[PDB]
Structure 1
Amino acid sequence: SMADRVLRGSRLGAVSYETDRNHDLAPRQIARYRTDNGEEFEVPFADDAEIPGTWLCRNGMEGTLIEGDLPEPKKVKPPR
């Protein structure tokens, strides 16, 4: 079976690969991207990088950049 659009996850988790807290944390940008089935995923970018208009999602489809929050809260661009 298949569907044209689908929404699935993530109340029961979960993250991919052998990730652990021993990796530590560093200055980053968490973006979101939406696939062609409407499936939305999150992509962490490092301070050495920026967010391109689109990026490949873990579903195996090219996702397009969307915001995970509202148009006009208290939000600004600087510093990163």
Structure 2
Amino acid sequence: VLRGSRLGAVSYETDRNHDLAPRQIARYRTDNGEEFEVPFADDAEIPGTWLC
């Protein structure tokens, strides 16, 4: 078989929904009065401009 790959990889790691890193949804507003939520992590400054 030619045996190609998409690059990247797989990672079986037991999916957890219980103990998850804390998040701080940050709202941004484009020019055309369109809000957009972005779940950034708390331990990082929220950038002042996002390509929504």
Give TM-score, length-normalised by structure 1: 0.37
Unaligned runs of 5+ in 1: 1-5, 58-80
SS of structure 2 residue aligned to 1:44: strand
- With over 3 angstroms needed to count, the CA separation of the structure-2 counterparts of 1:16 and 1:39, relative to structure 1, is farther
Give how far 1:15 is off.
Answer: 23
User: Which of structures 1 and 2 has the bigger CA Rg?
Assistant: 2
Give TM-score, length-normalised by structure 2: 0.52
Query: What's the RMSD between the two structures over aligned residues?
Result: 11.4
4+ residue runs over 4 A deviation: 6-24
Distance verdict in 2 for CA 1:18–1:29, change over 3 Å: farther
Q: Is the aligned partner of 1:36 residue 2:31?
A: yes
Gap runs ≥5 in structure 2: none
The structural deviation recorded for 1:9 is 40
Asked if structure 2 preserves the Cα contact closer than 8 Å seen for 1:32 and 1:43, the reply is yes
